[PDB]
């Protein structure tokens, strides 16, 4: 039995909304966001993790291209292999590709593994968000409506399952009969509902939100 609605922000596991700027680091922010929640659950401290650390270090060997794109899963594996990721405070985001400057003396979190959910199963995604924590996902944000989104439950007739933008599901619920996923974006606090966007849930894997979900564990 799963709760009808969930919002991890109420549980203190979600940091402030970040602004990626002109650097395509959505994948990095999605990844640190998921781990930030696990760090809170494990240690009791809420700490923004270094997305820059990922942009700069989880590079070619992980199939990532810094400001030109990357994967949340391989980002998680990097943290695992690297035996750590620095805090955002010690390794600030500059919205540009830099030489890897990771240092274990600034480590703020570790990762032991990650789990990729089965393709397109929103019911499995719901279970993971309710019982595990925020889940990193990819969505189709290629449409004008996404950029122009301001409030309510987002539904785009032209959306596809071909995802291109990494975000973080921090909860779910329903708005007057319209079910949705509560999504934390990395386009600053001025985008959508102060950094967040509620996307159609249980509407045939709308915009591929349940296409490639994954979450890390400490």
| Nearest CB to ligand CRL, comparing residues 36 and 40 | 36
Helices (H), 93-200: 122-131, 144-148
Which member of 8, 27, 76, 181 binds ligand CRL (CB under 6 A)? 27
Establish if 165 lies at the interface with ligand CRL (CB under 6 A): yes
Which CB, 18 or 165, lies closer to ligand CRL?
165
User: Beta strand 178-184 with 165-175: parallel, antiparallel or unpaired?
Assistant: antiparallel
**H-type alpha helices, 65-212:** 72-82, 122-131, 144-148
Out of 33, 66, 134, 166, point to the residue binding ligand CRL (CB under 6 A): 166
Footprint on residues 114-143 left by ligand CRL (CB under 6 A): 138
- Candidates 188, 183, 214; CA nearest to 70 is 214
Choose the binding region for ligand CRL from 20-28, 36-44, 110-118, 197-205 (rule: CB under 6 A): 20-28
Distance in Å, CB of 103 to ligand CRL, minimum: 25
Number of residues that bind ligand CRL (CB under 6 A): 16
- By CB under 6 A, tell whether 164 contacts ligand CRL: yes
d(CA 101, CA 147): 33
Distance CA 80, CA 198 (A): 31
Q: How large is the angle between the packed helices 26-43 and 72-82, nearest 10 degrees?
A: 50
Closest to ligand CRL by CB, 28 or 200: 28
Find out whether 55 and 97 touch, Cβ atoms under 8 Å: yes
Q: For ligand CRL, which is the closer residue by CB, 40 or 72?
A: 72
- CB of 167 vs ligand CRL, minimal distance in Å: 8
Both tokens of 127, joined, read: 């279970």
For the annotated catalytic residues, the residue numbers are: 26, 165, 185
């Amino acid at each position: 039995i799963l709760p009808d609605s969930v919002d991890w922000r109420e549980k203190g596991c979600v940091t402030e909304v970040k602004y990626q700027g002109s650097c395509g680091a959505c994948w990095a922010f999605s990844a640190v966001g998921a781990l930030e929640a696990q760090l809170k659950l494990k240690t009791g401290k809420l700490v923004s993790l270094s997305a820059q650390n990922l942009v700069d270090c989880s590079t070619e060997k992980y199939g990532n291209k810094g400001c030109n794109g990357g994967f949340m899963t391989t980002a998680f594996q990097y943290i695992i292999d690297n035996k750590g990721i620095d805090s955002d405070a010690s390794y600030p985001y500059k919205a540009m590709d830099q030489k890897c400057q990771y240092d274990s003396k600034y480590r703020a979190a570790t990762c032991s593994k990650y789990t990729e959910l089965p393709y397109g199963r929103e019911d499995v995604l719901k279970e993971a968000v309710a019982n595990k924590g925020p889940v990193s996902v990819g969505v189709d944000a290629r449409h004008p409506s996404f950029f122009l989104y301001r409030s309510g439950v987002y539904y785009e007739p032209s959306c596809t399952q071909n995802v291109n933008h990494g975000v973080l599901v921090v909860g779910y619920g329903d708005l007057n009969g319209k079910e949705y996923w509560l999504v934390k974006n990395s386009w600053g606090h001025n985008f959508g509902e102060e950094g967040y966007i509620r996307m159609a849930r249980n509407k045939g894997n709308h915009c591929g939100i349940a296409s490639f979900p994954s979450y890390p564990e400490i």
